[PDB]
């Protein structure tokens, strides 16, 4: 099942107070009116991809959803973030937990912390190893689907776990539908009111009207014609062409040669017509000095040359 | 700890006395990026992270942004915008045994380069050939960790060095790690030269009715200058109005 | 896991013949194969390693060949002291799996056994049990029949036998048959004898002794 | 001298534990990976376990996973095999074998070139018993040409094995030590014979040296013609 994300998924991009201002920022936001997968907890707790950040939302009446699991294999082989909220105690752990075949709750650790009627929205993203958690709780009176409207999510948690997170799973209390969306590096125009509360936003890539609103840095567009962007047909696939040749460049007999020449009579070798495997070089640790000028080692393996001189 | 399993420590809610560090002369390497040591004692931070490991001297130059090598690519990578300090000192008298200290390991093979501040402790057999490995070491199937030599008679490039990488996250937020600087009393409705958690400037500090959220520490104007601050001792919001001025 | 299949299971040849043993790997193992010789009840001796490299001290009549999944051990000129079981072992990875082994026998000319009989010792007789032993020394082939007779009564079910492996020098066999009786039954009879029938004997040979001589 | 000396074999009841040792000499033990290989009586060679140059990788055959543990002490230049939850089928001769030298980007082709002497492990509910050694005296008739036979009977011992030597190792030519037979009593029986000139029976002394280490039994039995 899928539903309409409408205008949900906007959070405060930083911790700076602003008011009565339209601020343009680019970050990982939930695209407006995107499709979000709708899961049910009636009469369904699969593992979902994490990709570049996950929007999570839930509707509650009896606090059935109580936690989250984040990781890659969720099977005690790697570190996996576990968040459990049991009654009044929020528990966060990053242990290598051994999870059940179907994790649920009945009615080498590096960090530990212990502390429908309700809509609880969350954003989970990993930036340079930092797992950032945003959320907002609000009263609602709607069972069928996500309420329509706008509400900004403040940041609450930033865990420097340094874990490569690719998949996640939820935790249900078994004796509550929830939605999963995905974030994109979109630019949003955020409207801060006189109290510093975000009251509206423009998704600069939603529709041409939103593009115009972002271009003019305003939520009102006067009658007329505006140039806001540029249409470009993006490429679909890459084309990689190189001369077909399987010879390996004889880097072995240049570096690992038994005898070397005096510096005044330095020996020059010409390398031509061979596949150059530079991995061995920067990967070997015999060398005391390794400095490159005009080019970088990492971008060397994917680069051709007319000739190479050693 | 070994460099592949480098230990991270979280420093929060304490006065950081950095004087001892740059004043001690035991350290062979002390280099800071994004900030200067002299201007460090008078500066607050949201969190401080202390990553600690051991490598050899040849690899000390790899503990820096924009560096490549086994340690930088497969063991410990710093982001290009790193804001912190790197401290290293020779531990040959401690981390060397007459028969060779083989407790310190490093990752030698990996299918991809580590992201900044990534920690890989997996011991999966590296598949270096077309034949798949079924978890068993052998031909074109590598154990990813190699052991350091570390012997008292080793050359300086191969002697052990203990490295500490202090990382600072200067994001404008409530501070918990501030330097050894005594506070003063606060004077309202007067032009003063203020310093709030390391943020300095000149202006008149007044009372305000701006309801900052519990996570917000600073306010800003259109020009990105500081508009108001929350007093770190008494949680009230003070507006900062630049001192009066005009053309003459 | 890669499996090794050795072939044949058993083979008999003659001195000077060329012997070929095959080792088949279920998957490629490059040239990480070794060949061992194991004499009966002895530590395995390494003959070939790296599929084709001869170990130091091994006679040059041994040779190895093959790569990937097919490997062949070759004994150019079989010699009497080559009687053993030969194994192949893969070591492309940590699983140093072995083959089932190939027993190498040697065919020679027929040899009649030397037959000896041994009465039970007096010290053993003090214990209440008598063991009579019949020795068949240096014969070929291995097929031989020993018939115990006690006062010309052919005995059955009260004896056990054991046969050595091919001798490393003359390729012959030897056989030891032990007839077990109680002291009372031992002293209830006089003539004890074993009759040996073998291809090398034109007629059965009987060795006997009288209790008391 | 480059060698591997094994120790720790003995008689064990099912379910108990036994620890084997392998002492390495004449080479840098810490540079090689080690393996355990066993061979049940009358059966082929079976690879048991593998430990890396410094023990960071370990592998076991499926028949011994969870019950056997391989380990090494590079400082003591020693290899160990702790065998728990032993079973009857674990009865075998156990060998330690040194592999090759793990180098950079090379699986060693020179490996498994040096083995131990083997040690016997017997898992059974039966109890130890030393053997009786009785002489098989040469024939009183014999022959005028020569070639007579004498020997020793090593009867009623447990467990395997017994070792038989002649004249303290100075008599090896023409010896045949037969494979042991398991008697219906549960005890083993073994015979060892030697053919010697008949003209030597009056001039040469013959003594068999039977050793049964499981029961700590050493017997030297004189074999001479009978008093007639
Ligand atoms: C983090 O984990 C993901 C998957 O859990 C890694 O992505 C995989 O990388 C391998 C290359 O070794 C590819 O073959 C897979 O197809 C990738 N999977 C996906 C879903 O992209 C990712 O590389 C890991 N991060 C790092 C830095 O290694
Ligand atoms: C959303 O889903 C509907 C059908 O479920 C599909 O027609 C529509 O194109 C989807 N839109 C997006 C943006 O995925
Ligand atoms: C919640 O769970 C944690 C660990 O799972 C436990 O320590 C804590 O006591 C629990 N809370 C309550 C109220 O039992
Ligand atoms: C935990 O870390 C240690 C490193 O000391 C490692 O050996 C171990 O395999 C890791 N995992 C578990 C489950 O202990
Ligand atoms: C700001 O908060 C005050 C309460 O002090 C309220 O009266 C006012 O309407 C709020 N303004 C906005 C734009 O929310
Ligand atoms: C260099 O060549 C020598 C042969 O003399 C070889 O032993 C050594 O391993 C080689 N080194 C490299 C890095 O290829
Ligand atoms: C710190 O400042 C606060 C003012 O908000 C005061 O109440 C508190 O007692 C002070 N503590 C100390 C130790 O001076």
Sign of the CA dihedral running A160, A164, A167, A172: negative
Whole-angstrom distance, CA of residue C138 vs CA of residue D225? 23
The sheet carrying A35-39 orders its strands as: A2-4, A35-39, A178-182, A54-60, A118-127, A130-139, A154-159
Chains touching C (at least 3 CB pairs under 8 A) are B, D
- Counting from 1 in the atom list of ligand 7, the atom nearest the Cα of B235 is 5
Whole-angstrom distance, CA of residue D15 vs CA of residue D83? 10
Q: Which CATH class for the D132-223 domain?
A: mainly beta
Whole-angstrom distance, CA of residue C39 vs CA of residue C44? 7
- Counting from 1 in the atom list of ligand 2, the atom nearest the Cα of A34 is 13
- Counting from 1 in the atom list of ligand 1, the atom nearest the Cα of A72 is 5
Tokens read off for D96: 């330690």
Whole-angstrom distance, CA of residue A214 vs CA of residue D190? 100
- B234 Cβ closer than 6 Å to some ligand 7 atom: yes
Task: Please give the CATH architecture assigned to the domain spanning C114-210.
Answer: Sandwich (2.60)
- What are the residues whose beta carbons fall under 8 Å from the beta carbon of A121, sequence distance 6 or more? A8, A9, A55, A56, A57, A58, A135, A136, A151, A153
For atom 13 of ligand 2, the residue with the nearest CA is A34
Tokens read off for D170: 């100075």
Q: Are B28 and B88 in contact (CB under 8 A)?
A: yes
Q: Which residues of B touch D52 (CB under 8 A)?
A: 137, 143
Tokens read off for C95: 């699983």
Count of other CB atoms within 10 angstroms of residue D37 = 25
β-partners of residue A230 are none
Q: In the block, which residue shows the tokens 């007839």?
A: C179
Q: What is the DSSP string of chain A?
A: -EEE-TT---B-SSSEE--SEEEEEEEEEPPTT-EEEEE--------EE-TT-EEEEEEESS--EEEEEEESS-SSSS--EEEEEETTEEEEE-------SS--EE-----EEE---EEEEEEEEEETTEEEEEEEEEE---SSSPPPS--PBEEEEEE-------EEEEEEEE---EEEEE-EEEEEEEEE-TTS-EEEEEETTS-HHHHHHHHHTSS---SS------------S---------PBP--HHHHS-S----GGG----EE-SSB---HHHHH----S----SSS-STTTTT---S-EE-
| Degrees to nearest 5, angle at CA B63 with B57 and B68 | 100
Instruction: For D186, list phi and psi in degrees, rounded to 5.
Output: 85, 0
User: Residues near ligand 6 with C-beta < 6 Å?
Assistant: A 252, 256
For atom 5 of ligand 6, the residue with the nearest CA is A258
- Give SS3 for D88: helix
CA distance B248 to chain A (A): 32
C-alpha to C-alpha distances, B86 to A48, A261, B65, B83, C34, nearest whole angstrom: 39, 39, 11, 10, 52
Element containing residue D196 per DSSP (H, E): strand D188-196
C-alpha to C-alpha distances, D88 to D13, D16, D43, D83, D125, nearest whole angstrom: 8, 11, 14, 13, 9
The answer to whether chain B touches chain A by having 3 or more C-beta pairs less than 8 angstroms apart is yes
Q: State the virtual CA torsion across A89, A90, A91, A94 in degrees, nearest 10.
A: 180
Q: Are D40 and D150 in contact (CB under 8 A)?
A: no
C-alpha to C-alpha distances, D76 to D31, D73, D101, D132, nearest whole angstrom: 14, 5, 19, 40
Count of other CB atoms within 10 angstroms of residue B222 = 10
- Give the CB-side neighbour count of residue A211, counting CA atoms within 13 A: 11
**Pocket-testing residue among A70, A164, A165, ligand 1, by greatest number of atoms within 8 A of Cβ:** A164
Which of C28, C32, C93 lies nearest to residue B136, judging by beta carbons?
C93
- A194 Cβ closer than 6 Å to some ligand 5 atom: yes
Q: Of A199, A235, A27, give the one whose Cα is nearest residue A123.
A: A27
**Pocket-testing residue among B121, B122, B144, B145, ligand 4, by greatest number of atoms within 8 A of Cβ:** B121
- CA–centroid distance, residue D168 to ligand 4 (Å): 55
Whole-angstrom distance, CA of residue A158 vs CA of residue A160? 7
- A19 Cβ closer than 6 Å to some ligand 5 atom: no
C-alpha to C-alpha distances, C138 to C147, C175, C180, nearest whole angstrom: 18, 9, 24
C-alpha to C-alpha distances, A148 to A32, A140, A206, A307, nearest whole angstrom: 12, 10, 17, 64
Whole-angstrom distance, CA of residue A102 vs CA of residue B118? 29
- A96 Cβ closer than 6 Å to some ligand 4 atom: yes
Whole-angstrom distance, CA of residue C6 vs CA of residue C38? 15
Question: Rounded to a whole number, what is the largest CA-CA distance in chain C?
Answer: 70
Q: Do C127 and D115 touch (CB under 8 A)?
A: no
Specify the experimental method: cryo-EM
**Chain C contacts in chain B segment 117-146 (CB below 8 A):** 131, 133-134, 136-139, 141
Whole-angstrom distance, CA of residue A219 vs CA of residue A235? 33
Does residue D107 belong to the interface with chain B, where contact is any CB pair within 8 Å? yes
Count of other CB atoms within 10 angstroms of residue D55 = 15
Chains touching D (at least 3 CB pairs under 8 A) are B, C
From its phi and psi, is residue A129 left (phi > 0), alpha (psi between -120 and 50) or beta? Answer: left
Rg (CA), chain B: 24
The answer to whether chain A touches chain C by having 3 or more C-beta pairs less than 8 angstroms apart is no
Q: Chain D: residue nearest C159 by CA?
A: D183
Q: Which residues of C touch D193 (CB under 8 A)?
A: 116, 135, 137, 174, 176
- CA–centroid distance, residue A96 to ligand 3 (Å): 18
* Spacing of C-alpha D140 from chain mean position: 36
β-partners of residue B204 are B191, B241
- What are the residues whose beta carbons fall under 8 Å from the beta carbon of B121, sequence distance 6 or more? B4, B5
- Counting from 1 in the atom list of ligand 2, the atom nearest the Cα of A33 is 13
Which of C93, C101, C164 lies nearest to residue D176, judging by beta carbons?
C164
- CA–centroid distance, residue A220 to ligand 6 (Å): 73
Q: Chain C interface, mutation test: which of B129, B136, B143, most C Cβ atoms within 10 Å? A: B136
- What are the residues whose beta carbons fall under 8 Å from the beta carbon of D14, sequence distance 6 or more? D86, D87, D88, D123, D124, D125
Whole-angstrom distance, CA of residue B47 vs CA of residue B32? 17
Q: Are A59 and A179 in contact (CB under 8 A)?
A: no
Q: Of C47, C27, C163, give the one whose Cα is nearest residue C102.
A: C47
Tokens read off for A154: 């403040």
User: Residues near ligand 2 with C-beta < 6 Å?
Assistant: A 2, 34-35
- Give the CB-side neighbour count of residue B212, counting CA atoms within 13 A: 23
Whole-angstrom distance, CA of residue D59 vs CA of residue D48? 9
Count of other CB atoms within 10 angstroms of residue A72 = 16
- CA–centroid distance, residue A98 to ligand 3 (Å): 17
Q: Do D54 and B102 touch (CB under 8 A)?
A: yes
Sign of the CA dihedral running A182, A185, A190, A196: positive
Q: Of D141, D44, D57, D128, give the one whose Cα is nearest residue D93.
A: D44
**Alpha helix (H) ranges present in chain C?**
122-127, 183-187
Tokens read off for B48: 């401080």
The sheet carrying B29-33 orders its strands as: B7-11, B48-56, B160-168, B84-90, B29-33
Q: Do B139 and C32 touch (CB under 8 A)?
A: yes
Sign of the CA dihedral running B171, B173, B175, B176: negative
Q: Which residues of B touch D105 (CB under 8 A)?
A: 128
Count of other CB atoms within 10 angstroms of residue D111 = 23
Whole-angstrom distance, CA of residue C190 vs CA of residue C212? 8
Breaks in chain A after residues (C–N exceeding 2.5 Å): 43, 107, 115, 175
Q: What is the DSSP string of C172-202?
A: -EEEEEEEEEEHHHHHT--EEEEEEEETT-S
Q: Do C32 and B131 touch (CB under 8 A)?
A: no
Which sequence spans correspond to the domains of chain A?
2-232
Instruction: For D215, list phi and psi in degrees, rounded to 5.
Output: -105, 5
β-partners of residue C98 are C89
Whole-angstrom distance, CA of residue B163 vs CA of residue B71? 12
- What are the residues whose beta carbons fall under 8 Å from the beta carbon of D148, sequence distance 6 or more? C116, D138, D139, D142, D195, D196, D197, D198, D201
Breaks in chain C after residues (C–N exceeding 2.5 Å): none
Whole-angstrom distance, CA of residue C89 vs CA of residue A159? 52
Tokens read off for B230: 């929350």
Q: Of C37, C52, C205, give the one whose Cα is nearest residue C117.
A: C205
**Alpha helix (H) ranges present in chain B?**
19-23, 70-74
Q: Are D107 and C92 in contact (CB under 8 A)?
A: yes
DSSP B55: E
Q: In the block, which residue shows the tokens 């140059």?
A: D53
Q: Which residues of B touch C1 (CB under 8 A)?
A: 134
- A193 Cβ closer than 6 Å to some ligand 1 atom: no
Q: In the block, which residue shows the tokens 């075998």?
A: D92
Pick the CATH number of A2-232 from 3.30.200.100, 2.60.120.960, 3.50.50.60, 3.20.20.10: 2.60.120.960
Q: Chain C: residue nearest B136 by CA?
A: C94
- Counting from 1 in the atom list of ligand 6, the atom nearest the Cα of A258 is 5
**Nearest ligand, CA B120:** 1
- A108 Cβ closer than 6 Å to some ligand 4 atom: yes
How many separate helices (H) and strands (E) can be counted in chain C? 2, 18
**Alpha helix (H) ranges present in chain D?**
none
Q: State the virtual CA torsion across A125, A127, A130, A131 in degrees, nearest 10.
A: 10
Whole-angstrom distance, CA of residue B27 vs CA of residue A213? 56
- CA–centroid distance, residue A23 to ligand 5 (Å): 20
DSSP B19: H
**Nearest ligand, CA A193:** 5
Q: Are D5 and D114 in contact (CB under 8 A)?
A: no
DSSP B152: T
- A115 Cβ closer than 6 Å to some ligand 3 atom: no
Which residues of chain D does CATH 2.60.40.10 include?
A: 3-123, 132-223
- Counting from 1 in the atom list of ligand 5, the atom nearest the Cα of A197 is 14
Tokens read off for A184: 């994109």
β-partners of residue D51 are D34, D58
- CA–centroid distance, residue B233 to ligand 7 (Å): 6
C-alpha to C-alpha distances, B4 to B125, B214, D118, nearest whole angstrom: 15, 38, 40
Superfamily of domain D3-123: Immunoglobulins (2.60.40.10)
B122-135 exposure pattern, b = at least 16 Cβ within 10 A, e = fewer: eeebbeeeebebee
Which of B102, B139, B147 lies nearest to residue D107, judging by beta carbons?
B139
Q: Which residues of D touch B138 (CB under 8 A)?
A: 107
- CA–centroid distance, residue A35 to ligand 2 (Å): 6
Peptide bond into A223 cis (omega under 30): no
Whole-angstrom distance, CA of residue C186 vs CA of residue C132? 10
Q: Do A128 and B222 touch (CB under 8 A)?
A: no
Whole-angstrom distance, CA of residue B132 vs CA of residue B141? 8
Chains touching A (at least 3 CB pairs under 8 A) are B
- Give the CB-side neighbour count of residue D110, counting CA atoms within 13 A: 7
Q: In the block, which residue shows the tokens 């009111």?
A: A193
CATH 2.60.40.10 fits C4-106, yes or no: yes
- Counting from 1 in the atom list of ligand 3, the atom nearest the Cα of A88 is 13
The data reach a resolution, in angstroms, of 3.5
Count of other CB atoms within 10 angstroms of residue C39 = 16
Instruction: For B41, list phi and psi in degrees, rounded to 5.
Output: -60, -30
* Spacing of C-alpha A248 from chain mean position: 39
């Amino acid at each position: 099942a899928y539903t309409n994300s409408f205008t949900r998924g906007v959070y405060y991009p930083d911790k700076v107070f602003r008011s009565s201002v339209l601020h343009s920022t680019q970050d990982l936001f939930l695209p407006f009116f995107s499709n979000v997968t709708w899961f049910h907890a009636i009469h369904d707790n699969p593992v979902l991809p994490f990709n570049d950040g996950v929007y999570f939302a839930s509707t509650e009446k009896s606090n059935i959803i109580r936690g989250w699991i984040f990781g890659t294999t969720l099977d005690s082989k790697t570190q996996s973030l576990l968040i459990v909220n049991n009654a009044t105690n929020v528990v966060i752990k990053v242990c290598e937990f051994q999870f059940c075949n179907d994790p649920f709750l009945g009615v080498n650790c590096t960090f530990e912390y212990v502390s429908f009627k309700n809509l609880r929205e969350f954003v989970f993203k990993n930036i340079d190893g930092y797992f950032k958690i945003y959320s907002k709780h609000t009263p609602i009176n709607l069972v069928r689907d996500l309420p329509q409207g706008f509400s900004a999510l403040e940041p609450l948690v930033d865990l420097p776990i340094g874990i490569n997170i690719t998949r996640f799973q939820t935790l249900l209390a078994l004796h509550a539908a929830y939605y999963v969306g995905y974030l994109q590096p979109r630019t949003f125009l955020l409207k801060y009111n006189e109290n510093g509360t975000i009251t509206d936003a423009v998704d600069c890539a939603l529709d041409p009207l939103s593009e115009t609103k972002c271009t003019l840095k305003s939520f009102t567009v006067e009658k007329g014609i505006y140039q806001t962007s540029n249409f470009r047909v993006q490429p679909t696939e890459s084309i990689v062409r190189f001369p077909n040749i399987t010879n390996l460049c004889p880097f072995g007999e240049v570096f690992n040669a038994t005898r070397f020449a005096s510096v005044y009579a330095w020996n020059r070798k010409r390398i031509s017509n061979c596949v150059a495997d530079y991995s061995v070089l920067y990967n070997s640790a015999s060398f005391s000095t390794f400095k490159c000028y005009g080019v970088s080692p990492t971008k060397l393996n994917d680069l051709c040359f007319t000739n190479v001189y050693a | 700890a070994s460099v592949y399993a480098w230990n991270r420590k979280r420093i929060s809610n304490c006065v950081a006395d950095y004087s001892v560090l740059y004043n001690s002369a035991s350290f062979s390497t002390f280099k800071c990026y994004g900030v200067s040591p002299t201007k460090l004692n008078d500066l607050c931070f949201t969190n401080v992270y202390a990553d600690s490991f051991v490598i050899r001297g040849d690899e000390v130059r790899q503990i820096a942004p924009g560096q490549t090598g086994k340690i930088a690519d497969y063991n410990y990578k710093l982001p290009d915008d790193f804001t912190g300090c790197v401290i290293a000192w020779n531990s040959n008298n401690l981390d060397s045994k007459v028969g060779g200290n083989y407790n310190y390991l490093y990752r030698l093979f990996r299918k991809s380069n580590l992201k900044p501040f990534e920690r890989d402790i997996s011991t999966e057999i590296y598949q270096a050939g077309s034949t798949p490995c079924n978890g068993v070491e052998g031909f074109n199937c590598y154990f990813p960790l190699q052991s350091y030599g570390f012997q008292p008679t080793n050359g300086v490039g191969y002697q052990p060095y203990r490295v500490v990488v202090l990382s600072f996250e200067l994001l404008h937020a409530p501070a918990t790690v501030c330097g050894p600087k005594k506070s003063t009393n606060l004077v309202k409705n007067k032009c003063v030269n203020f310093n709030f958690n390391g943020l300095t400037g000149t202006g008149v500090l007044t009372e305000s009715n701006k309801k900052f959220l519990p996570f917000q520490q600073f306010g800003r104007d259109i020009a990105d200058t500081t508009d108001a601050v929350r007093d770190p001792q008494t949680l009230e919001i003070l507006d900062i109005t630049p001192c009066s001025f005009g053309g003459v | 896991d890669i499996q090794l299949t050795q072939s044949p299971s058993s083979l008999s040849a003659s001195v000077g013949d060329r012997v070929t043993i095959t080792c088949r790997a279920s998957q490629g193992i490059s040239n990480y194969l070794a060949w061992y010789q194991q004499k009966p009840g002895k530590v395995p001796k390494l003959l070939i390693y790296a599929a084709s490299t001869l170990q130091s001290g091994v006679p040059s009549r041994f040779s190895g060949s093959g790569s990937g999944t097919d490997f062949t051990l070759t004994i150019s000129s079989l010699q009497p002291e080559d009687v053993a079981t030969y194994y192949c072992q893969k070591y492309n990875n940590a699983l140093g799996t072995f083959g089932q082994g190939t027993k190498v026998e040697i065919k020679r000319t027929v040899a009649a056994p030397s037959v000896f009989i041994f009465p039970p010792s007096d010290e053993q007789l003090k214990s209440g049990t008598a063991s009579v032993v019949c020795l068949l020394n240096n014969f070929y082939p291995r097929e031989a029949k020993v018939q115990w007779k006690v006062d010309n009564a052919l005995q059955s079910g009260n004896s056990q036998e054991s046969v050595t492996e091919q001798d490393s020098k003359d390729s012959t066999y030897s056989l030891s048959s032990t007839l077990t009786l109680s002291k009372a039954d031992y002293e209830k009879h006089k003539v004890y004898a074993c009759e040996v029938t073998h291809q090398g004997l034109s007629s059965p040979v009987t060795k006997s002794f009288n209790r008391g001589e | 001298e480059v060698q591997l000396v094994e120790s720790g074999g003995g008689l064990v009841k099912p379910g108990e534990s036994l620890r084997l040792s392998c002492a390495a000499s004449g080479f840098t033990f810490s540079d090689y990976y080690m393996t355990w290989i066993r061979q049940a009586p009358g059966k082929g060679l079976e690879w048991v376990s593998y430990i890396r140059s410094s023990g960071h990788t370990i592998y076991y055959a499926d028949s011994v996973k969870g019950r056997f543990t391989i380990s090494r002490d590079n400082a003591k230049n020693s290899l160990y095999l702790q065998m728990n939850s032993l079973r009857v089928e674990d009865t075998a001769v156990y060998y330690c074998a040194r592999g090759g030298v793990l180098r950079f980007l090379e699986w060693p082709l020179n490996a498994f070139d040096i083995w131990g002497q083997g040690t016997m492990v017997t898992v059974s509910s039966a109890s130890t018993k030393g053997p009786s050694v009785f002489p098989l005296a040469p024939s009183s008739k014999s022959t005028s040409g020569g070639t007579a036979a004498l020997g020793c009977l090593v009867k009623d011992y447990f467990p395997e094995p017994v070792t038989v030597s002649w004249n303290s190792g100075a008599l090896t030519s023409g010896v045949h030590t037969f494979p042991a037979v398991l008697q219906s009593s549960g005890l083993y029986s073994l015979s060892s014979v030697v053919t010697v000139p008949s003209s030597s029976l009056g001039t040469q002394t013959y003594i068999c040296n039977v050793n049964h280490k499981p029961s700590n039994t050493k017997v030297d039995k004189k074999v001479e013609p009978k008093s007639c």
